[model samples]
Target chain A: VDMYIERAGDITWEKDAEVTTTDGVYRVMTRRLLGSTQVGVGVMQEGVFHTMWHVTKGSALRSGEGRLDPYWGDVKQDLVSYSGPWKLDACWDGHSEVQLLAVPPGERARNIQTLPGIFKTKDGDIGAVALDYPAGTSGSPILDKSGRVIGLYGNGVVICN
Target chain B: VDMYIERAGDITWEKDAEVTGETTDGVYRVMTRRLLGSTQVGVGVMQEGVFHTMWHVTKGSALRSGEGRLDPYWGDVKQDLVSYSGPWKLDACWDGHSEVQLLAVPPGERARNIQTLPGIFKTKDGDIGAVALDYPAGTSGSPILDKSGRVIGLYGNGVVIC
Candidate 1:
């Protein structure tokens, strides 16, 4: 009935998930059946919301085991776009529970005042901002000052592409 | 000329993804060039002048030739990118995603630095490193960069012969 979620370390993303504004990031209990991931985040390219395919290594959004897209009530936004270029999101202890909506301080974020442009990697266009998000914030949308989707917090950092 | 010219999944890559022919870097999109065929994509990393990735990335695809280069995996490895040791206590990034890659990852990450290289080349060897810290089929060769954003080891999911 009551299952505790370990939204801290080794969080995994499952299902060929589809998300909307209400969708939020959190840890799952079925990782043992599939595999465990460190952090899990969602990304939307053309409204097709998917999590970090790279973070899970050999795993991906399998079309079957899709979890019901639920709102974690952590972040606030209607859109999502990946925004990470290595440690772009906030920092976490990796052992503690990922607090809901625990975002990084703007001053600490590598945003406009910190990181300026986008970085291109084989993974895609990633950029970093100084902002921080807790561990569970993976798959949450990272917004710029203009209120636009810049990146999604995937894995442990902000994945900007 | 039979099945998928390109595997049609939810995934789609760059149109004629650019290739500079510089393998042995950190990470790259392994591209297969055919004499008169379409290009297939795979991923991998070249660390310490060694290339590593999965055998499946470019498995069946008949590559007339192949070349890869730095996805850099980082903004720049030569420079100091990381300032926080946040990843030391389980906050680790494997294969150096798009962000800082190493960004100076705490300077003391990676507990087990086994499998000393420069002896033999390798690719993906299955969960060799750590997740939350690390890929795709194309990502087989991605680099496993640690602390200084420096390439600590090469990624490989394939079986090791040496």
Candidate 2:
């Protein structure tokens, strides 16, 4: 399974740019520029060391002038993680339906919709919407009745039961 | 601004089926089959009562000769994707706080329901700073309504400041 890190907002960087931190350095491979939002993908030789790098947008990494926000920290213990395609707890076969845990803008009531299929990946999971999920619903978390975090919700992207 | 037509379900066809309507003789040819059930979207023209259309216009070609019909009836038509067909009706205004009507309603209720708009509205302060909208959870894509029942903006999508 491949690891990924994503951030929204004014991200600027040149391809093959060097990303360094206290632990190690990484090379920015593919940087997808979408409107004002940018997504960059990079690779490291050691899989465990991938968590040490942090990213900030609109600032140059070479100058070392931008804030070095810590994206992930070093884990002291070795953890057993399963590589996807993983199955959703209690909701297997990807056909079982799940509800969205999103609160609308003005009120305190929770919004619930029964979306279909749970798609699992190494980083997260994805669910299908009837047409398209609202852009405002992005960042909301998806959960089962038992209150498990099945996946995180977002517009245009997939991840839910 | 462009108009689009979208339908749901596994729409497929074998070539050479007669789709012509008896009354108007309007022929609907089954022109495509998409592997993914939910990925199908297409356009069609109806002559009187007969419907003529194709699926996955962008992918694959049609083969000729076979009978075709929906085994299980397709689900409801739902909403239509349309573009701005005419000029904005001027009387519509953005009062900040308003009611939103969603097409999908709670079970056993009407097909639509009304809820209040989220985010700080345009009242006492004349746009000093913008408040991040807190759109109602299920009200995404609903129509925002003013007191006179005029449509101001689409819920959960965008709105005019003034």
Candidate 3:
């Protein structure tokens, strides 16, 4: 009974106890032909993905945690998405070859260890699943042993299947 | 014999031109140090050089003909000033060497020039002028061909002093 949650247009957690949850699995994929500020797709589940914008269009995403604010956050627990065509903005290591949500130019954010699972795609284009659940629906984003969200909607709980 | 004009700060062309004709060689040295604002000091045979500001600081300067708009008119030229640190900002090519300005971290800009002239500094430190100049009252700030002006100190200009 895994759950996943993926929303559009920057999300923020206002309260300390407030938790954002989703069903099934969550998977973020990298794009090559996409331009900055354009909405690209991500794989939320097998045969399912959605369009999302690059976290860092020009500048690197701020790394930090504790109640996600939006572009600025403590990316200590974030994953590396992509790196190429330019440089990395924020990573554990100072140089290249480091991953974390706070990517430099031409890089994509990837799941750390929490999201580890298989997602079947039908259209071949990357897709993403909606993490915001309907009212009265109990769900959670399926995280891997390392706390990474792999699939967005699968295992019946996630709808992006 | 060589004539010139330099203007800076709240000083206007109308007021500066009035004093231009009064200047004599080797008397007063017009010191142009880009302060936080447009404030600048002119001493000695004061001549208002061309000036451009950005972010409230002097970003660029050139020789100007004191006229209706204070148009920049080339008089004497010097080597471009180089930063002590930072990434490469500009590229320069000379007789047997190429110089590059690299942007270094915090407080300084770096310059890397091909080994041709006597090595005074390393690429990491950019380039250091053979001489140091004093501003406000000395000709050391920006030296022209004529060396007979009020001898000030020598070093480099705030911007590119080549």
What lDDT does each candidate get? 0.29, 0.28, 0.21
RMSD of 1: 18.4
lDDT of 2 by residue, B61-112 (tens): 2222223232211212111112111222323455555433322221112223
Q: Give per-residue CA lDDT, model 1, range A8-118, as digits (tens).
A: 222122222222222333332113111232233443333234343322222223323342232122111212222222222443222222222222211111222223234
For residues B1-162, what per-residue lDDT tens digits would candidate 3 score against the true structure?
Answer: 011234221211121111103322222223222111111212212223222211111112332334322223222223322111122222222221222221111101111111112123323346432321111111123322111221111122222224
lDDT of 3 by residue, A13-77 (tens): 11222122121222221121111111122222222222121111112221122111123221221
TM-score of 1: 0.28
Candidates 1 onward: DockQ, in order: 0.02, 0.04, 0.01
Candidate 1 lDDT at B111 equals 18
Whichever of 1 and 2 has more lDDT, that candidate is 1
Error of 2 at B35 (Å): 4.5
Error of 2 at A132 (Å): 14
1 or 2, greater by TM-score: 1
Candidate ranking under DockQ, highest first, comes to: 2, 1, 3
Over 4 Å off, model 2:
A1-161, B1-3, B6-35, B39-82, B89-91, B97-111, B121-141
Q: Tens digit of lDDT per residue, candidate 2, span A56-124? A: 111122212332222332211101111111132333235544454442222222435464544454446
